[PDB]
Point group: C4
Chain length 355, copies 4
């Protein structure tokens, strides 16, 4: 709610071309199809192949900035990004070679930051997952066994064995309800009463495991990326020690591209930003274009008014952002600091229009 | 649990009439129907049309308070609120013109505050949603592919292609269980074991994304709307800086309409209010009707007793509200403040009955 | 994890007898049944009727403690607890009179504390629920309409009208998957991709609304019930103002009945209690039976050892409870207080065995 | 995200062998099977039987450390781990004796720490569960009754009685959608609209009950296990009282086995550890092998740089772990402490390479 994400966060064409590349698959998978577009898109693989392959060798030029780097991740596919189709092209003479379009699916995951964020936490909380994962199997076979006891007599064809019911079990436990084969008696139908009660409590916990410290990590993502852009602010020599932990939880940074709008005039002033790198277009008669290491919005927030400028992205700017309360927190947190933002709230009343 | 919401929060008839207006649709959609009520409700569209249209031009009189306003949102439908049926009335000569009753559905969303609250946060956290949204597709086709490997032999008619299984996949992944076409073999049925395990963990996270900072926003909704009604209280010059952030998280304001009841006598005193605008009916022999900028409940809370008055809404009052703990927090937070609420807790023992 | 709930929390037989009373229904609902037990349980209604009716008049003796009371809730059924079957007995001469066994279902909800806890919060957060409830209908008909566009041609019998699909919609949206009538084409099947994506995000929020401040209320239930039993402790004149809010969030009270065990000896000391009313059986050679207003466990927690006594419920005791960290919080929170619990941790080393 | 779990957390073979032991079952459960492997795995039960039985008597040697112990839990199966198959072997002469392979399922739960963690909290919050569990049945039969009212006429065969619909009810309420027997009329289909609305709100709460204080318990698991390994650190005489509660919430300990890697060099420094027992392989020209009671990472964190050593597990080490913010919290929390970690951040610049 307090951030302006722009400049094509899904930027790199390396990620873009996996998407059309795999829709290339399906038309090959279908009878009653003409050969015309059949191979037209076979080329498109050769394009994306050739294209990533065109990108490839420039990546293999890893002499740029070659001081200390750990590029096993960023390379682990790019190797396979071209080889796996290649040997697939020959040894799989039949059209099924395209079945090695299981390969580009990681290419989005190449530059999927937020995916290392995923795997990072599993190596802390999987302890829980295992004991639950067992417990899933505990509650599975403990209960999945229960049905073989009963309908083996009159449902051999469906419940004539154990795993036939373990099938029904997880479908019965995992919120699913397929609806192929269901009992007929009372006591077997009695059993289900605790099952949905269970599985929704189980994944009531188990799925809860993920978001639990995942949120910690992403709420931690809002700090680890953002204990940076701190000393750049010339004013933050005076902030207290615990002051930042209270603050930086909320603070997120994003980039805005040149030409875009930052805060349009007259729309309700709901947030203030800290510039640390780039430049702006503060729409005034004398444009107060502030470069790396500035801010604005106190004009609107201390007053609680609309915007005093159609501030717009003159350049590519590394932005921060902040709503009132957490700045009211700052105005509360220090008399020494609100003095200047009082002055700024008078300086930029005159300085916005003047030079 | 600590708020009295009254005065028709679903107030404006602009929102009310979208509801009956669209039930007007369905009777047209049905064979074996008489023409009698068929067109009777066609008029009702003309009513709601004419009615919003009656409202419309008065809205187009936007010279009232025409100083600085951003009414592209509040107008974006009202334009289309009447034009889309209109051209639909002619060009779609067949009865299907009513299919442009997809239009009024936004009219509730016109004055749906809490909907800008919705869209506000998506422009901070969609970063997550995308990488997850991809990851959904990652886990989709990574796994959805897996079934074409197998039952193409003996289920051409169901699993004779890729997307036929991507269909089954999301139904298999998204907690659904339709139950049209399901495998027959072991290994394909083996695969499902991790699927519900996945999809409930995925949306275990992904759906968790929404409520995560949505709650922040609505818990922030309880401040941004309520850093107002602060200086109106004549006592809040002395409150400490961080004191408010601890408090205003809990504080919610709502309005009560005239004539209604506020706290009935003898029912258990569980909360105290801060009046800031309006007037009351404090049921005493001498009614202590306190106007803008007052409070009551300390009589009951410091004692932990029932109510001392059938306090009732004499007028339309802008109310706040507060339970004990967060007022016990206040009584704890300052000796300078509990002195007066001690006095008030003796003044209103005599002043409630006296003048 | 830090509480000992005992003494039959499902105590009152008023609640107990609704359970067997309604199983009395079903045997009447079934052909091929003998009249023998058919009416045997008809009497059991007359028993529970007669029994609650036996209880009833003693309740109508509401002169006990008749000073200030609000018993419209506790009486609202007891009136109907006997009248509704009664007039049902005659006017519904056919056996269907028992269909007014919809009545006792509230009798558990008579003395269901935690049910007023339920309804309390809905009158603060239903504001959200409505705008979501609308939004549910927004997203309902916005999308439910989408299918009538398509398969009306070749599925008149299933998708020949609007509400036929609104049916499929919520089943398609609400995580359900019945599996009666499903499309056949591509684009209609394309549509579902955002639906489960939606409904799990919708109730990802909407169901999240309940637990959100419900947890606040139950976490508030742990205070509002427990700002009591505070001044009874003779030591809590010295606790700091904000000290309690940090503490009482964790503190829960429950009752234990006479004869039961409180903490068995030698089992791992994981918690300490504050007695405020009742008496105990501290299993020592000289039983240190401490009455209203005492505690124990510091012997085990400061040492981190097993229990020093099979402390057991001599009488019906109003207990509190507390784990280490929040007592380590206390030992941290004040040097003035750990002095005595140091002394107590030496006094009860000698006093436990001695007198 | 801040922990290195290693050394086979699923260590004990007592737990390992329940897994293969129960797959031994299913082949017996299947017609058209040869007797060859039929009894080959019957032996494997005798192995696991004999094996746990081999383990058994050594466990019955409970004279080791026989001072004060509560081993009713750890023994409650080991007794039955061998007896239940045994009497099953004879009295159940038919092959169905293996149906007492319901027995080993608890053997993983023998040494399933995190399972006592499970049951611990249910004896605090089941109060809620009951009133909800009733409320489930309230909302069950309140609504489950509703359908018998209607389709008894034209669906005797499906809805000719009460429990036939209670079946459909929970399937209709518990997110399931089996799809065997569904109504045909309007008003009965009207009813479902509030049902999924209900059941997802019910388990929206009820399943929420588990994770609620379960997370408290596991977030408490991160303290109760970790108020230990505190005084071992020679520096923690000076930490403030409330300082730890702020910290130890985040701190988790795990073990790493000998030979493994701890932090590889050049990978991004994202965390620092506190050693308290064991030894390491700090990869330097002069290995700075620090034993029980040490730490490292401040070299990387105060600088925000990669690792200065391929620190690797020379021995089995009891580790702690910590990311920056919570150490930045420490560097913030005390000037007296950052002095030494400044010195250490200069000492280990020279001491890492030197002796
Ligand atoms: K389902
Ligand atoms: K189904």
């Amino acid at each position: 709610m307090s951030v302006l994400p722009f400049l094509r966060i899904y930027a790199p064409l390396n990620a873009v071309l996996a998407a059309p590349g795999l829709l290339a698959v399906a038309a090959l998978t279908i009878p009653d199809m003409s050969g015309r577009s059949r191979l037209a898109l076979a080329a498109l693989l050769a394009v994306i192949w050739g294209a990533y392959l065109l990108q490839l060798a420039a990546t293999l030029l890893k002499r740029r900035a070659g001081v200390v780097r750990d590029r096993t991740p960023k390379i682990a596919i790019d190797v396979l990004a071209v080889l796996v189709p290649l040997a697939a092209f020959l040894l799989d003479g039949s059209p099924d070679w395209s079945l090695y379009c299981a390969v580009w699916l990681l290419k989005p995951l190449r530059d999927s930051t937020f995916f290392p964020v995923l795997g990072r936490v599993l190596a802390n909380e999987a302890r829980n997952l295992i004991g639950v994962t067992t417990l899933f199997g505990v509650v599975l076979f403990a209960v999945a066994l229960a049905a073989y006891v009963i309908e083996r007599d009159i449902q051999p064809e469906k419940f004539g064995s154990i795993p036939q019911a373990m099938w029904w079990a997880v479908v019965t436990l995992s919120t699913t309800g397929y609806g192929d084969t269901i009992p007929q008696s009372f006591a077997g139908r009695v059993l289900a009463g605790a099952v949905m009660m269970s599985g929704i409590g189980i994944f009531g916990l188990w799925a809860g495991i993920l978001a639990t410290g995942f949120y910690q990590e992403v709420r931690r993502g809002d700090f680890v990326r953002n204990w940076q852009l701190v000393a750049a602010v010339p004013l933050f020599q005076k902030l207290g020690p615990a002051v930042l932990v209270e603050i930086v939880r909320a603070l997120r940074a994003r980039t805005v591209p040149a030409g875009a709008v930052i805060c349009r005039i007259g729309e309700p002033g709901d947030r203030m930003f800290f510039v640390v790198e780039g430049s702006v277009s503060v729409a005034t008669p004398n444009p107060v274009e502030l470069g790396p290491g500035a801010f604005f919005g106190e004009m609107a927030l201390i007053s609680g008014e609309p915007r005093s400028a159609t501030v717009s992205a003159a350049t590519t700017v590394s932005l921060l952002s902040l709503h009132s309360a957490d700045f009211q927190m700052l105005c509360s947190s220090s008399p020494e600091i609100a003095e200047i933002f009082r002055k700024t709230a008078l300086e930029r009343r005159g300085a916005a229009a003047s030079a």
